[PDB]
Structures are given as structure tokens and as C-alpha cells.
Design a protein around this ligand. Structure first.
Ligand code: HEM
Ligand code: HEM
Ligand code: HEM
Ligand code: HEM
Lengths: 145, 138, 139, 145
């Protein structure tokens, strides 16, 4: 699924990532950049201004969860339908989320990573992540029925 | 689509980009061909090697056009009319590819300007790239 | 940029559909839930089993909306404005879903009306269902 | 990749299909309903109006030719990637066909099946074919670089 070199770029970069802040930012931005998504998070307290969103305690906590999920995907690239099968059923049967929306969180996650690593975030490294974020979206949509 | 709050944002930010527009224009393109290889099918007669000069030449034309749209946010469909003809009638580019560029343009403005690329500005830049892609594909 | 030929292709075809419209809209939806199971996420509250009365009822509301777009081909943005509020603002339905539905509207119309489903008519229906999808998702 | 009931419907129906007639029709329609595709077929001749296209000898032949790779694929459902790999290189390197355009043929082929088999064309039979059709298009796309 990923070349020996693509896995180099990916994990080499991910070891550097501070799983705390990056989560509450990917997630924080999903909310401002595409605000219609706020509906799925109505029980998160105040989400009424970017200011309050970025700084919302329960947004950051979800961030980490989202991101460790992502972390576990990397320990498992060779079989990602495997690693996200319980999460697919979750997002479908419990949350009723259009799988199209997965594109969006992968995208914001890619932007944060770029915000954080500038010159280090080169066309080649980015092309590695997209392949992952495309796969994490496909794996999440797999157990929809 | 595009409040007045949105247009300040885009303008202010384009100010900072200034003389780097065309340089970003190219980098975003090399990133697009690079993450979304399919986009390459529309440039079979190009030299697409990393750092190809022909891309930098193309990169510039995209940026000016973008600068162009920033100065006609209030009526894009008119300003860009000649460009939607090219992209809809002559080349006929699938609307999916616009998402890929607009994405990589954003990633491009993020590697270079982390300070200015705040979520509110991120949100604004998106509706802007998106608003443009809409004119060029209709 | 529906042409004179598009419009009258479509009115003629819709003319023939007659009072089977709601029947077809029911079937289109069934086909879409079935061939394109993520469309369901948008109806988590309906009984979506085969023959479900809810789907039938909705089928009518769809087919009526389309009848009314055929009547107002020249100002769809105007005619469909309420409905584009709904789908664009309130419900946020990804534009990808609309492609699924119009494809299934084509399959349905093809299954029941092969004599009018000539390549030219098929070309016009596809444009029409696009125009309607753009109008419904454009805000 | 396809449940046996599914494969039963797919094969069931594909058995009654006149490869000859449905082939030209699917490809004819591709070109009428989505005329921008004509660019890729200039060498076929008069591709002016619809009656030009639906009667064009070459169109008809290529049609049959496309439909066979469909049958090959059917006969090789569980490894579609391998069955199309070379058509995938072809459509990529000689042809410069954006794979987005693969869905389009798929859908048209589906419409032609509905036009031909009418009431025999179940919501279920169709659901199986969309699966085929989305799969075929995934394979022909897999080898793009
Ligand atoms: C990159 C793709 C995504 C991943 C990897 C992901 C991951 C996760 C994870 C790990 C959980 C935790 C489950 C638990 O606590 O038991 C979760 C729950 C949840 N997900 Fe996501 N998600 C993704 C996309 C989305 C999107 C776009 C939405 C909104 C449209 C969404 C909506 C939710 C909601 C509302 C919850 C439950 C929150 C709560 O009430 O506790 N997911 N997801
Ligand atoms: C904001 C988005 C875009 C903008 C502003 C834009 C703008 C332009 C401009 C200014 C030109 C130059 C035409 C000339 O030099 O006279 C052009 C040409 C072209 N564009 Fe784009 N474009 C966009 C998106 C795309 C996308 C996504 C694709 C497909 C991958 C694409 C494919 C092409 C092609 C093939 C040409 C002609 C190249 C040649 O033969 O020289 N465009 N566009
Ligand atoms: C040509 C395409 C479509 C047309 C003409 C159409 C038309 C309609 C109409 C007439 C209503 C009724 C509003 C009311 O009952 O007052 C409705 C509601 C609704 N539509 Fe659509 N629609 C289309 C596509 C879609 C698609 C693709 C989806 C998502 C898959 C969708 C989701 C909904 C939902 C979830 C409701 C109401 C929720 C409920 O009934 O409780 N629509 N639409
Ligand atoms: C949907 C699945 C498709 C399949 C299975 C398929 C299959 C094939 C095959 C087997 C050939 C072999 C030519 C030979 O006999 O050597 C071919 C050629 C070709 N294909 Fe496709 N194709 C598909 C979709 C498309 C699409 C969407 C386009 C572009 C709109 C396209 C454009 C072409 C062209 C231009 C040729 C060469 C024709 C010539 O100049 O002789 N194909 N295709």
C-alpha cells in the first residue's frame, strides 16, 4: 500500500508531531473552516466564535482521540479496513455521518501539518500523507450498509 | 457565499503574499501533480519534472488570475468569463481537479505564512478558492 | 444552457410520465438507497425497508418538486429557492449525493419508458437533472 | 468482493446480453450525452449529431471491444486489479484520460442495461452492477502515476 520510502517520510514526520496540540487544531479548524459540521458536536459547550472554539476544553480532548486513532492507523497501514472497522460502524450506525465528510478532516489535518512544519512539509512528504488520509477515509467508509 | 468579513480577510492576506504570488502559484501546482497524479493527464505536452521552468511559467499565470479575482470578488463571473470558457468549453477539466488545486494552494499558503494563516483566514481562503472554482467550472 | 431542444425534449418526456411521477420518484429513491447506501445517512429517521410508505410519500414530494422545475425551466434559481435553502443550508447534503439520485432517476425513466429514452432525450434529461442539482446545492 | 447471490444476478443477466448491440449503444451514448469525450475519438470520423454517432461503424466496433473487457472482468471478479492493469497503463500513458471519466461510461452502461431489460432490472440487480461498474473504474485507475 505504501513504499518503503513513503513509510519513511510518514513516520519520520509523525515522530516529530506533538499529538496534543495537533489534534485540538485539526479538529478546531474542521469546525471553523466548515462550520456546518458543528451540528455533530452540539454537546461540546460553546462553539459560537472561532475564538471560543480553538480554546474549548472538550474540542481539544476529542482532538487527541481522533489523532491517536490516526496514530494507530500508522502501526497498521497494510490493513486499515482492519484498524478502523469498529470506527466505521460507529460513524455510520451511531452518528449517521456521510463518509464524504472524511475528506474534510483529512484535509484540515494536512493543512495543520503544513502550518507546523513549513519547508519540511515538501511536495513529496505531502504526497505521502494524502495516500494515508485517502486510505483512512476509505477504511472509515467500508462498513457502511 | 463570501461575507464582507470574508473579503477583508482575503485582501489583507493577498497583500502579504505580494511579490511571492507567482512563486506560490508554481509550488502549489508541483504539489497538485504530485499528490493527485491524475491532474497530470491535462498536461501531457508539459515538462512536469520537479522545478520544470514551464510549470513556473504556468504557475505565474495562475497567480495573476488569482490576483485578478481578488480584485473582482464582487463580480467574479464577469471578470473570469474568458477563463471559464477555456476550462469548461475548450479543455473541459473535471470539477474534482479544482478541489485538488485549491487544496494544495491552501497547503501552499500555510507552509509559507503560518502567522497569517489563522483559522478565520483559513476559512476565508477556502470559500475564496472554492468560489473561484465554481466560476471556472460552470 | 439548456437549449430549446433540451427544454422540449424534457417537457415531452415529462408529459408522457404523467401520473406515474410519484411512483417513479418512489422507485428512484429506493434504487438510490440501495445502490448507494451512504445516501441513507440523510434519512436516519425513515422506515427505509422495501415498500415503506414513508419512502412512497417522499417519492411524491420529490416528483412534484421536479414537475415544478419542468414548468419553470427558465428560472430554476427562482422556482427552487425554498428547496435550495433546505438542501444547501439546513440539511447540508453533499453535492456527491445528487449525482447518485439523478443517475437513479435516469435508470428509472429508462426502465419504464424505453421508447422515449432515445440518446438525445437521455442527453437532455441528464442536463436537466444537473441544472436542478446545481440550483439545489449552490449556497 | 461480491457475495454469491450478487454474482448470481450479475452472471444471470450478463448471459442474456447481446455483446454486439449493447456495446455500440453504451459508447454511442457516452459520446452523445457527454460530448466533451469526443476529443478522445476524433479518428473515428463523423461524430457530429446523435444519428451520426449511433450509426458510426467504428464507434460500434470499439463498443464491442470495451464490453469484452467487461466480460473478462466479470470472469475475474475477485482480482479486477490484475485484469485491467494494462488497460490502466494504456488509458494513462498513451491516452491521458482523467479517470473521473470512467464513472461516466459505467453509468451509461448501466442505463443501457435498464433501457434493454426494463422491468427485469431490479433495484437489486442494479445494486450489484453498480458494484461491478465502480470496481472496474477503480482498477483502470490504479496504475496512474
Ligand atoms: C479522519 C476521519 C475521522 C476519524 C479518524 C474520526 C475518529 C473518531 C474517533 C476515534 C472517535 C472516538 C469514538 C469513541 O469515543 O468511542 C470518534 C467519534 C465521533 N466522531 Fe469522528 N472521526 C473522523 C471524521 C468525523 C467527521 C467529519 C465527523 C463529523 C461530521 C465525525 C463525528 C464524530 C462524533 C460526533 C463522535 C462522538 C463525539 C461524542 O459525542 O463523544 N467524525 N471519531
Ligand atoms: C483557481 C484555479 C485555476 C485557475 C485560476 C486557472 C487559471 C488558468 C490560467 C490563467 C491559464 C492560462 C491560459 C493562458 O495562458 O492563456 C490556465 C490554463 C490551463 N489550465 Fe488552468 N486554472 C485553474 C485550475 C485548473 C485545473 C484544476 C486544471 C486541471 C488539472 C487546469 C488545467 C489547465 C490547462 C490544461 C490549461 C492550458 C495549458 C496550456 O495548454 O498552455 N486548470 N488556467
Ligand atoms: C433532484 C433532487 C432532489 C429533489 C427534487 C428533492 C426534493 C425534496 C422535497 C420536495 C422535499 C420535501 C420538503 C418537504 O417535505 O417540505 C425534500 C426534503 C428532503 N430532502 Fe430532498 N430532494 C432532492 C435530493 C435530495 C438528496 C440527494 C438528499 C440526500 C440524499 C435529500 C435529502 C432530503 C431530506 C433528508 C429531506 C427532508 C427530511 C425529512 O423528510 O424529514 N434530498 N427534498
Ligand atoms: C469504463 C471502462 C473502460 C474500458 C474497460 C475501456 C477499455 C478500452 C480498451 C480494451 C481499449 C483497447 C483498444 C485496443 O483494441 O487496443 C481502449 C481504447 C481506448 N479507450 Fe477506453 N475504456 C474505458 C473507458 C474509457 C473512457 C471514459 C475513455 C475516454 C473518454 C476511453 C478512451 C479510449 C480511447 C480514446 C481508446 C483508443 C481508441 C483508438 O484511438 O483506437 N476509454 N479502451
Amino acid at each position: 500500500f505504501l513504499t518503503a520510502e513513503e513509510k519513511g517520510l510518514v513516520n519520520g514526520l509523525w515522530g516529530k508531531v506533538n499529538v496534543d496540540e495537533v489534534g485540538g487544531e485539526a479538529l478546531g479548524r474542521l469546525l471553523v473552516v466548515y462550520p456546518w459540521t458543528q451540528r455533530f458536536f452540539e454537546s461540546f459547550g460553546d462553539l459560537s466564535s472561532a475564538d471560543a472554539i480553538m480554546s474549548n476544553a472538550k474540542v481539544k480532548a476529542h482532538g487527541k482521540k481522533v489523532l491517536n486513532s490516526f496514530s494507530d492507523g500508522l502501526k497498521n497501514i497494510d490493513d486499515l479496513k482492519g484498524a478502523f472497522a469498529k470506527l466505521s460502524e460507529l460513524h455510520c450506525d451511531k452518528l449517521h455521518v456521510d463518509p464524504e465528510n472524511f475528506r474534510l478532516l483529512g484535509n484540515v489535518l494536512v493543512c495543520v501539518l503544513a502550518h507546523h512544519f513549513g519547508h519540511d512539509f515538501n511536495p513529496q512528504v505531502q504526497a505521502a500523507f494524502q495516500k494515508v488520509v485517502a486510505g483512512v477515509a476509505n477504511a472509515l467508509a467500508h462498513k457502511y450498509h | 457565499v463570501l461575507s464582507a468579513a470574508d473579503k477583508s480577510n482575503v485582501k489583507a492576506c493577498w497583500g502579504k503574499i505580494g511579490s511571492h504570488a507567482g512563486e506560490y502559484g508554481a509550488e502549489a501546482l508541483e504539489r497538485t501533480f504530485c499528490s493527485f497524479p491524475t491532474t497530470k493527464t491535462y498536461f501531457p505536452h508539459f515538462d512536469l519534472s520537479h522545478g520544470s521552468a514551464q510549470v513556473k511559467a504556468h504557475g505565474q499565470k495562475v497567480a495573476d488570475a488569482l490576483t485578478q479575482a481578488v480584485a473582482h470578488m464582487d463580480d467574479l463571473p464577469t471578470a473570469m468569463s474568458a477563463l471559464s470558457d477555456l476550462h469548461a468549453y475548450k479543455l473541459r477539466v473535471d470539477p474534482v481537479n479544482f478541489k485538488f488545486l485549491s487544496h494544495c494552494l491552501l497547503v501552499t499558503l500555510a507552509c509559507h505564512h503560518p502567522a497569517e494563516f489563522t483559522p478565520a483566514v483559513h476559512a476565508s481562503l477556502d470559500k475564496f478558492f472554492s468560489a473561484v472554482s465554481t466560476v471556472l467550472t460552470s
